[PDB]
Amino acid sequence: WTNTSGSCKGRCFELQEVGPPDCRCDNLCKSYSSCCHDFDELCLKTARGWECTKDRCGEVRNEENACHCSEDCLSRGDCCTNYQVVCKGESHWVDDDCEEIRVPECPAGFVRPPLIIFSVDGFRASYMKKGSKVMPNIEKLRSCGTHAPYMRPVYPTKTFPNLYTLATGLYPESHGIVGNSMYDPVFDATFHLRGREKFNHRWWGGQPLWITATKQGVRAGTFFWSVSIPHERRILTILQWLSLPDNERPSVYAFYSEQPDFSGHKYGPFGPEMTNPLREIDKTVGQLMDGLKQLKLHRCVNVIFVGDHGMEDVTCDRTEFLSNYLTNVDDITLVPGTLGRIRPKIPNNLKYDPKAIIANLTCKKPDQHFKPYMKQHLPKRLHYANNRRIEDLHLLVERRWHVARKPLDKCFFQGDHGFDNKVNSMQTVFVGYGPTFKYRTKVPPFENIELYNVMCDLLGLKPAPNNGTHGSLNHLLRTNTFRPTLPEEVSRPNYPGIMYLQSDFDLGCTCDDKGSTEERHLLYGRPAVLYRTSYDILYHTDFESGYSEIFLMPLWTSYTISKQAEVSSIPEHLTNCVRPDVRVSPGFSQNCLAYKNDKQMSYGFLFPPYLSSSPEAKYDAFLVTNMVPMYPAFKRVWTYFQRVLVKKYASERNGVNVISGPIFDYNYNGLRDIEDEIKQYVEGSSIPVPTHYYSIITSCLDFTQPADKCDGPLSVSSFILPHRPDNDESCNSSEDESKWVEELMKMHTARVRDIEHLTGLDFYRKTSRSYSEILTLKTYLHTYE
Ligand SMILES: *[C@@H]1O[C@H](CO)[C@@H](O[C@@H]2O[C@H](CO)[C@@H](O[C@@H]3O[C@H](CO[C@H]4O[C@H](CO)[C@@H](O)[C@H](O[C@H]5O[C@H](CO)[C@@H](O)[C@H](O)[C@@H]5O[C@H]5O[C@H](CO)[C@@H](O)[C@H](O)[C@@H]5O)[C@@H]4O)[C@@H](O)[C@H](O)[C@@H]3O)[C@H](O)[C@H]2NC(C)=O)[C@H](O)[C@H]1NC(C)=O
Ligand SMILES: *[C@@H]1O[C@H](CO[C@@H]2O[C@@H](C)[C@@H](O)[C@@H](O)[C@@H]2O)[C@@H](O[C@@H]2O[C@H](CO)[C@@H](O[C@@H]3O[C@H](CO)[C@@H](O)[C@H](O[C@H]4O[C@H](CO)[C@@H](O)[C@H](O)[C@@H]4O)[C@@H]3O)[C@H](O)[C@H]2NC(C)=O)[C@H](O[C@@H]2O[C@@H](C)[C@@H](O)[C@@H](O)[C@@H]2O)[C@H]1NC(C)=O
Ligand SMILES: O=C(CCN1CCN(C(=O)OCc2cc(Cl)cc(Cl)c2)CC1)c1ccc2[nH]c(=O)oc2c1
Ligand SMILES: *[C@@H]1O[C@H](CO)[C@@H](O[C@@H]2O[C@H](CO)[C@@H](O)[C@H](O)[C@H]2NC(C)=O)[C@H](O)[C@H]1NC(C)=O
Ligand SMILES: [Ca+2]
Ligand SMILES: [Ca+2]
Ligand SMILES: [Cl-]
Ligand SMILES: [K+]
Ligand code: NA
Numbered sequence: 001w002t003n004t005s006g007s008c009k010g011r012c013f014e015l016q017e018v019g020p021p022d023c024r025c026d027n028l029c030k031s032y033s034s035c036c037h038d039f040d041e042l043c044l045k046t047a048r049g050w051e052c053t054k055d056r057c058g059e060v061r062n063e064e065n066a067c068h069c070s071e072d073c074l075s076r077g078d079c080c081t082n083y084q085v086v087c088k089g090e091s092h093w094v095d096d097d098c099e100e101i102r103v104p105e106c107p108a109g110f111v112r113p114p115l116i117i118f119s120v121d122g123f124r125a126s127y128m129k130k131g132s133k134v135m136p137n138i139e140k141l142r143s144c145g146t147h148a149p150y151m152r153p154v155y156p157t158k159t160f161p162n163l164y165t166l167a168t169g170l171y172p173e174s175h176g177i178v179g180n181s182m183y184d185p186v187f188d189a190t191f192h193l194r195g196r197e198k199f200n201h202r203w204w205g206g207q208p209l210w211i212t213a214t215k216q217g218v219r220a221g222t223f224f225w226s227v228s229i230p231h232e233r234r235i236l237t238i239l240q241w242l243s244l245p246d247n248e249r250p251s252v253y254a255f256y257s258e259q260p261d262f263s264g265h266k267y268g269p270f271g272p273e274m275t276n277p278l279r280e281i282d283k284t285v286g287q288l289m290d291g292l293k294q295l296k297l298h299r300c301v302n303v304i305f306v307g308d309h310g311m312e313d314v315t316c317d318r319t320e321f322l323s324n325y326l327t328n329v330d331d332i333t334l335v336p337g338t339l340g341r342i343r344p345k346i347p348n349n350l351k352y353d354p355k356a357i358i359a360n361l362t363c364k365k366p367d368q369h370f371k372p373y374m375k376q377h378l379p380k381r382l383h384y385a386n387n388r389r390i391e392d393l394h395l396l397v398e399r400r401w402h403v404a405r406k407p408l409d410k411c412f413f414q415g416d417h418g419f420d421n422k423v424n425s426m427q428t429v430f431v432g433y434g435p436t437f438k439y440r441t442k443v444p445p446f447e448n449i450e451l452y453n454v455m456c457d458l459l460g461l462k463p464a465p466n467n468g469t470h471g472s473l474n475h476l477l478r479t480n481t482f483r484p485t486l487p488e489e490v491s492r493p494n495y496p497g498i499m500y501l502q503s504d505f506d507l508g509c510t511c512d513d514k515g516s517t518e519e520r521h522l523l524y525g526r527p528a529v530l531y532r533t534s535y536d537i538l539y540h541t542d543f544e545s546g547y548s549e550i551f552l553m554p555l556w557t558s559y560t561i562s563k564q565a566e567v568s569s570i571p572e573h574l575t576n577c578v579r580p581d582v583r584v585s586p587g588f589s590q591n592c593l594a595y596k597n598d599k600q601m602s603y604g605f606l607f608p609p610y611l612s613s614s615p616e617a618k619y620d621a622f623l624v625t626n627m628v629p630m631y632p633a634f635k636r637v638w639t640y641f642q643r644v645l646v647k648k649y650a651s652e653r654n655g656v657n658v659i660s661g662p663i664f665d666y667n668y669n670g671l672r673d674i675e676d677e678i679k680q681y682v683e684g685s686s687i688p689v690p691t692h693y694y695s696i697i698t699s700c701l702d703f704t705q706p707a708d709k710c711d712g713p714l715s716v717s718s719f720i721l722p723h724r725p726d727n728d729e730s731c732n733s734s735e736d737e738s739k740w741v742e743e744l745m746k747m748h749t750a751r752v753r754d755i756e757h758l759t760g761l762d763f764y765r766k767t768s769r770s771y772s773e774i775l776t777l778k779t780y781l782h783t784y785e
């Protein structure tokens with residue numbers, strides 16, 4: 001119980017959090033039904049509106065007014081934002097020329113620039129194309145400050161997962177807010193957009209920016225605004241807090257707008273009804289900038305104008321129904337819409353057959369507008385699996401479409417979001433303006449998981465452990481850049497020489513018949529191994545590898561293919577050639593007998609014999625130390641990549657450096673598995689089966705320079721292919737590989753950083769580039785939009 005008969009007099013929007021039985025006056029009181037009886041009348045004043053008029057200039061202060069035009073209002077920090085414009089002949093901030101901020105220009109008592117996070121819900125990246133005619137304030141921030149053409153949100157491209165990702169620097173699978181709605185099987189409770197369940201602390205993991213701030217003695221403003229508090233009041237409150245004494249004043253502030261998301265759902269992103277809501281948000285930005293200018297803070301504060309996700313054209317008519325694919329939809333619960341998550345209606349039903357359900361949802365209609373996946377098979381770039389709240393069965397929905405259980409479940413909407421985070425329509429905005437951000441600078445697109453580290457740096461805070469790559473966004477900043485340190489190598493390699501004779505081996509294999517290796521094939525230095533293990537560096541004419549004695553295969557295989565390289569076929573008599581490696585013991589080698597016995601498992605090679613520099617060098621590609629276990633269905637993908645696509649990339653990019661290898665992620669946590677976690681081996685052997693195969697393809701950004709003679713920045717594209725026993729994911733896989741393999745690889749595009757987490761390897765340790773630039777390169781994701 002709370003005594004609401006108390007009063008908010010002189011307590012409106014107080015920073016001290018009050019709890020029952022005392023009545024609250026803070027912004028959050030509304031969502032706990034604990035505001036004092038007079039909160040609306042004292043704290044949500046609307047009298048005379050939000051703008052000063054000429055007749056109000058120099059007025060005697062009236063406490064009933066929403067905002068003031070009295071001579072004392074600047075010293076009290078509660079002027080209407082246009083006070084100096086109307087009463088003192090000042091210009092609106094938007095009308096001022098763009099002037100470089102070389103150092104913060106703050107009033108006395110400020111020791112560092114405050115940070116204001118201006119969050120806009122559903123602000124699609126392409127809305128910026130409307131320019132100054134629609135949004136002059138936002139356009140000025142964008143062109144005068146630092147901006148990206150777009151920022152990549154996290155999957156699902158929904159509000160609660162993305163806002164909490166912005167606050168923590170974590171993937172939803174780690175922070176726990178995996179959707180706008182979610183069922184936790186341990187709690188046996190459901191989190192919803194509406195209701196009280198979401199207010200329970202048990203759902204919210206990690207460490208949000210406001211907690212990081214308070215734990216390190218930095219004061220934070222609210223990061224939650226009640227829908228009943230109008231935007232003009234949110235801006236005035238922030239300005240009032242910025243006017244508090246030095247010992248009370250917060251260092252970080254957040255503003256939130258439900259728009260343009262609200263109108264986006266009603267009218268779609270291309271709707272003519274979108275113009276007025278965008279003009280209204282721009283007016284709010286204008287009030288904040290004018291408000292800051294009159295308080296002499298417009299060249300003091302850092303402003304981050306950021307969105308949570310974009311908006312797509314989605315209609316009721318474009319809905320796929322599970323009732324058209326499955327006999328009994330009454331036995332299942334579906335999280336529907338722009339994504340699908342399926343689980344049995346009865347939480348632990350033994351009759352629930354996910355295998356039969358997936359089979360009925362796989363390639364059943366030619367233009368099917370969704371694809372089913374067991375969560376561990378989802379593209380690794382989504383990082384959407386390691387949480388009990390994520391159902392095993394997932395449906396990736398095609399952009400512009402919805403999925404529903406049955407038809408029973410005019411249309412209420414014309415727009416929606418939630419789709420795959422690489423989708424153009426889901427892309428959102430990023431603008432950084434102020435003394436710490438760069439002046440009139442465009443930066444390449446980046447992921448929202450990276451902002452938490454930057455916000456910590458802008459506030460002098462040590463970030464909590466997160467999924468960002470600290471230093472990868474250093475190019476956005478004038479100052480407060482993070483000096484990163486190269487991770488120390490944990491395991492030094494062995495460099496084995498010849499220690500065995502051909503006669504020492506009995507592997508059941510048959511075969512009919514250092515130097516400059518490092519310089520040519522290892523262009524960016526040796527990858528470092530960041531965990532404790534036993535491995536060997538093996539040199540060859542055409543490739544170099546880091547061979548694991550534990551996993552009996554390379555952790556990585558590195559090779560360079562020039563633009564002029566010749567592709568050759570494997571001679572008929574060498575098709576089944578596998579040769580013992582005299583540098584590696586029989587006890588630390590794979591064997592052909594295991595592969596022959598295993599009627600479901602074949603083998604591939606990491607360095608392809610097809611790309612050998614000579615028939616003599618080709619024999620090295622058939623070494624037992626270059627072989628890896630591969631399902632025949634996967635070999636169709638792998639062989640096409642090696643025989644066709646590597647040469648294609650070398651020819652188009654002027655040579656390529658390729659690093660390929662296995663990945664073991666049986667527990668789908670996005671991290672390298674330890675031995676005990678491996679759940680599949682080649683029949684009757686200790687040869688582990690990878691869950692995935694990666695490749696990192698590097699070349700010169702300036703393609704007029706060959707990959708092996710690049711003087712400047714690099715260009716990279718990578719992938720993490722699922723090692724599957726079938727090609728059920730690719731509906732057109734019965735056709736030639738030229739019709740589907742590339743499409744599959746593009747879907748499984750990845751960052752070098754994703755591969756580093758999955759392998760415990762550290763790449764690009766020896767380049768002529770700055771470490772900050774290399775960190776940006778590692779976070780790059782090649783999208784095929
Ligand atoms: C993205 O970045 C994060 C953060 O660095 C990485 O996640 C971390 O991984 C390490 C190594 O696996 C984990 O440490 C292990 O776990 C415990 C400590 O765990 C407890 O204490 C920490 C710190 O106080 C706390 O954050 C943990 O919170 C988990 O559990 C809460 C209660 O259930 C929950 O609310 C919260 O969301 C979080 O759940 C998530 O993590 C667990 C695993 O911990 C996972 O099962 C679950 O599905 C969620 O994803 C927890 O109380 C140590 O004793 C061990 O020795 C070991 O060191 C960290 O706990 C974990 N941190 C977080 C915040 O998840 C990701 O790996 C990285 N991803 C990639 C791909 O790089
Ligand atoms: C819920 O709150 C009501 C409103 O009170 C205000 O808000 C609360 C949260 C708190 O901040 C209060 O201080 C605010 O007044 C409560 O009603 C009030 O109850 C108090 C008594 O508990 C009343 O007081 C007296 O007011 C007189 C003036 O009108 C004073 O002269 C008097 O002072 C004498 O007594 C004190 C205490 O011994 C001495 O120290 C002094 O020297 C002096 O001799 C008191 O201060 C107040 O007037 C009430 N306000 C109103 C508007 O009625 C409410 O309390 C309940 O209801 C009231 C009507 C009484 O029956 C209470 O006994 C009863 O608890 C709160 N509800 C609950 C359940 O606690
Ligand atoms: O329910 C909501 C919004 C509810 N709140 C979001 C959080 N919020 C707030 O002020 O967040 C501010 C904030 C918090 C954090 Cl963690 C981080 C930052 Cl950078 C900023 C209050 C309003 C919603 C929004 C869009 C939707 N689209 C849709 O289909 O359903 C929707 C529901
Ligand atoms: C998968 O789809 C098939 C239809 O293609 C379902 O099988 C049919 O079920 C009905 C009963 O509703 C029978 O009358 C038909 O004879 C069945 N057809 C065939 C070809 O067997 C099947 O039930 C679906 N499975 C699931 C799990 O939904
Ligand atoms: Ca319309
Ligand atoms: Ca793992
Ligand atoms: Cl959801
Ligand atoms: K076999
Ligand atoms: Na509230």
Ligand code: NA
Nearest residue numbers: 727728730733
């Ligand atoms: Na197929």
Ligand SMILES: [Zn+2]
Nearest residue numbers: 121122159308
């Ligand atoms: Zn949103």
Ligand SMILES: [Zn+2]
Nearest residue numbers: 122261265417
């Ligand atoms: Zn929305």
